[PDB]
């Protein structure tokens, strides 16, 4: 049994969040030096960047951020609580930049911060412990009037998004174990720095996905120096940006580098419409994938087929598949598993599910992972290879010489191991890009922000160790898939 662990430490969705930046505006420093229209202008561009209206009786915590006109929260405090509470608490506070010590103490190690929690988070303390509320106050969490939260709202302070940050992830996670690492970029051309009197700066922007050709001339040298034994995964995804889904660009990053001496190893290709239950998919059409296929197997580029959907599945193993099969053996695959997805009928635009774990299922699965108990678990695995093993019998049997991986969003990666391997699959992927947490039994609630890709993949492989699998380096996967 030999696993390999591919590393996708950026992605499309999640964003980065400055723990050192204020994380509440109060209404009365925007209304009280602002005209109403530049303080609707301001109010309006913060709410496109995920903060949100609160009421007045949230508390914040402000050290050294003095702008004129304890950094300890220990175990027992948590341990008051209900798990589902000392969770929601400790995730805010990881996403805060907190850590968790050795002890399961929530820490903050640096000497100036700006760390607010919610109305709706303080009056569930509030009834469960009003003790705790009183400690945190006497720690100095001070009420707040109504204002705009930054709640990090699937955000890490730990995803990297430049050239440099994503170089060091990389690196990171191949020397915690990975093989591959998947790779998106992000456009950050449309960050504003707003200032706020009484308050200091807070920046904006979008961090959209977008492939940018000058991050990846930078980031494809910059790991292969370090660690040439890399084996680049580059996303062509356009999810976002669903009015490039026939652009060159979609594989203009696909080149032969000259300071690397090769092309990328693998990019991801999904031959079908992506259709995002949550929303905003991007095309595949027949034609574009023609262009995809004759450009990969020119310059030297493995596709990884993400399976999204069954009209994926479907494609790839009849109309697809002799493209497939030209493009190099073993076909790779990688089960986007746990993500809803829509099938839309071109004729009546209606839509249907086609996730490749039926949502009904997912929703159960959902549901079972909540109550946290180990028959449950057993139960929630049951269904994910339930949904999952036709699909990878079809796989198997239209493609023999292959590799498929798995993947989970987060919430759901507690199933990953068990479910890779009850799937007999030949590898698993983890990351920022799938999920921001990790497992800490340490801590009340036993979950916390992670403290990066390579920390995922660390624990994957420690579980994978411990099953008693063995995991494939770089080389031997370069050497095992002719890459
Ligand atoms: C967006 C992202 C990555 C966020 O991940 P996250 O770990 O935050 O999970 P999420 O479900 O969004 O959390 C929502 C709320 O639940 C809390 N929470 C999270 N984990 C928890 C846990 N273990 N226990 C209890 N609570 C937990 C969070 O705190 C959060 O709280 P609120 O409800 O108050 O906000 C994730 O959501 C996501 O979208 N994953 C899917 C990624 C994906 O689609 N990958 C496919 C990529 S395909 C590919 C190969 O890249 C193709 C290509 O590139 O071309
Ligand atoms: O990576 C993804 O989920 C995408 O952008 O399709
Ligand atoms: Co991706």
Redesign the pocket.
């Given at each position: 049994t030999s696993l390999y662990i591919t590393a996708?430490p950026i992605?499309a969705?999640?964003k980065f969040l400055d723990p050192f930046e204020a994380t509440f505006i109060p209404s009365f420093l925007l209304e009280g030096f602002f005209d109403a229209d530049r303080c609707a202008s301001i109010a309006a561009d913060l709410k496109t960047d995920g903060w949100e209206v609160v009421p007045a009786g949230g508390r914040l915590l402000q050290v050294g951020h003095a702008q004129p006109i304890a950094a300890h929260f220990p175990k027992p405090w948590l341990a008051a609580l209900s798990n589902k509470l000392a969770?929601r608490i400790v995730?805010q506070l990881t996403t805060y930049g907190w850590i968790v010590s050795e002890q399961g103490d929530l820490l903050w190690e640096h000497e100036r911060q700006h760390h607010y929690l919610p109305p709706a988070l303080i009056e569930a303390i509030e009834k469960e412990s009003p003790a705790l509320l009183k400690n945190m106050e006497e720690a100095g969490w001070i009420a707040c009037a109504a204002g705009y939260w930054q709640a990090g709202?699937?955000r890490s302070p730990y995803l990297p998004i430049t050239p440099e940050a994503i170089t060091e992830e990389t690196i990171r996670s191949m020397r915690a174990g990975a093989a591959v690492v998947?790779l998106?970029t992000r456009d950050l051309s449309d960050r504003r720095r707003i200032e706020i009197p009484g308050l200091g700066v807070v920046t904006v922007g979008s961090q959209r996905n977008q492939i940018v050709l000058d991050d990846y001339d930078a980031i494809v040298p910059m790991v292969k120096k370090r660690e040439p034994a890399a084996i680049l995964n580059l996303?062509?995804?356009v999810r976002g940006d669903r009015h490039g889904a026939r652009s060159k660009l979609r594989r203009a990053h696909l080149k032969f580098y000259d300071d690397v001496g090769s092309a990328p190893e693998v990019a991801?290709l999904?031959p079908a419409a992506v259709v995002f239950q949550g929303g905003g998919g991007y095309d595949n059409a027949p034609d574009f994938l023609d262009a995809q296929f004759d450009h990969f197997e020119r310059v030297g580029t493995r596709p990884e087929v993400?399976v999204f959907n069954h009209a994926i599945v479907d494609n790839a193993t009849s109309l697809y598949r002799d493209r497939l099969l030209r493009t190099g053996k073993p076909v790779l695959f990688?089960l986007?598993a746990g993500?809803d997805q829509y099938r839309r009928d071109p004729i009546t635009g209606e839509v249907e599910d086609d996730s490749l774990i039926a949502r009904v299922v997912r929703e159960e699965i959902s549901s079972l992972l909540a109550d946290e108990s180990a028959d449950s678990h057993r139960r929630a695995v049951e269904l994910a290879i339930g949904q999952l093993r036709p699909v990878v019998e079809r796989l198997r049997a239209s493609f023999p010489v292959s590799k498929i991986s798995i993947?989970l969003?987060?919430?759901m990666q507690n199933l990953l191991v068990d479910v890779a391997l009850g799937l007999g699959l030949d590898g698993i992927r983890v990351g920022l890009?799938?999920?921001?947490?990790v497992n800490d039994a340490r801590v009340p609630g036993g979950?916390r922000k992670a403290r990066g890709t390579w920390e995922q993949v660390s624990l994957v492989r420690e579980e994978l160790l411990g099953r008693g699998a063995t995991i494939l380096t770089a080389a031997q996967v370069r050497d095992m898939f002719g890459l």
């Amino acid at each position: 049994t030999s696993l390999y662990i591919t590393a996708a430490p950026i992605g499309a969705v999640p964003k980065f969040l400055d723990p050192f930046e204020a994380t509440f505006i109060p209404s009365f420093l925007l209304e009280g030096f602002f005209d109403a229209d530049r303080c609707a202008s301001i109010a309006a561009d913060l709410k496109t960047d995920g903060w949100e209206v609160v009421p007045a009786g949230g508390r914040l915590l402000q050290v050294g951020h003095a702008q004129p006109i304890a950094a300890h929260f220990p175990k027992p405090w948590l341990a008051a609580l209900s798990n589902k509470l000392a969770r929601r608490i400790v995730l805010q506070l990881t996403t805060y930049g907190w850590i968790v010590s050795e002890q399961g103490d929530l820490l903050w190690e640096h000497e100036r911060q700006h760390h607010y929690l919610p109305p709706a988070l303080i009056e569930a303390i509030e009834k469960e412990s009003p003790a705790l509320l009183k400690n945190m106050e006497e720690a100095g969490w001070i009420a707040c009037a109504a204002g705009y939260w930054q709640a990090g709202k699937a955000r890490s302070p730990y995803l990297p998004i430049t050239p440099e940050a994503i170089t060091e992830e990389t690196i990171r996670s191949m020397r915690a174990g990975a093989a591959v690492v998947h790779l998106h970029t992000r456009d950050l051309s449309d960050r504003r720095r707003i200032e706020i009197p009484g308050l200091g700066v807070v920046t904006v922007g979008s961090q959209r996905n977008q492939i940018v050709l000058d991050d990846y001339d930078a980031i494809v040298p910059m790991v292969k120096k370090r660690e040439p034994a890399a084996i680049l995964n580059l996303s062509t995804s356009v999810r976002g940006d669903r009015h490039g889904a026939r652009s060159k660009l979609r594989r203009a990053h696909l080149k032969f580098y000259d300071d690397v001496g090769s092309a990328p190893e693998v990019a991801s290709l999904s031959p079908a419409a992506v259709v995002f239950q949550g929303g905003g998919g991007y095309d595949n059409a027949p034609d574009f994938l023609d262009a995809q296929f004759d450009h990969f197997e020119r310059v030297g580029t493995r596709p990884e087929v993400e399976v999204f959907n069954h009209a994926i599945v479907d494609n790839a193993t009849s109309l697809y598949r002799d493209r497939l099969l030209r493009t190099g053996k073993p076909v790779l695959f990688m089960l986007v598993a746990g993500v809803d997805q829509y099938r839309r009928d071109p004729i009546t635009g209606e839509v249907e599910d086609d996730s490749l774990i039926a949502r009904v299922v997912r929703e159960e699965i959902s549901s079972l992972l909540a109550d946290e108990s180990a028959d449950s678990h057993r139960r929630a695995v049951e269904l994910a290879i339930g949904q999952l093993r036709p699909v990878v019998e079809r796989l198997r049997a239209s493609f023999p010489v292959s590799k498929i991986s798995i993947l989970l969003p987060g919430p759901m990666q507690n199933l990953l191991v068990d479910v890779a391997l009850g799937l007999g699959l030949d590898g698993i992927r983890v990351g920022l890009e799938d999920g921001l947490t990790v497992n800490d039994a340490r801590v009340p609630g036993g979950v916390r922000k992670a403290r990066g890709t390579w920390e995922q993949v660390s624990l994957v492989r420690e579980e994978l160790l411990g099953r008693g699998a063995t995991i494939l380096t770089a080389a031997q996967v370069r050497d095992m898939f002719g890459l």
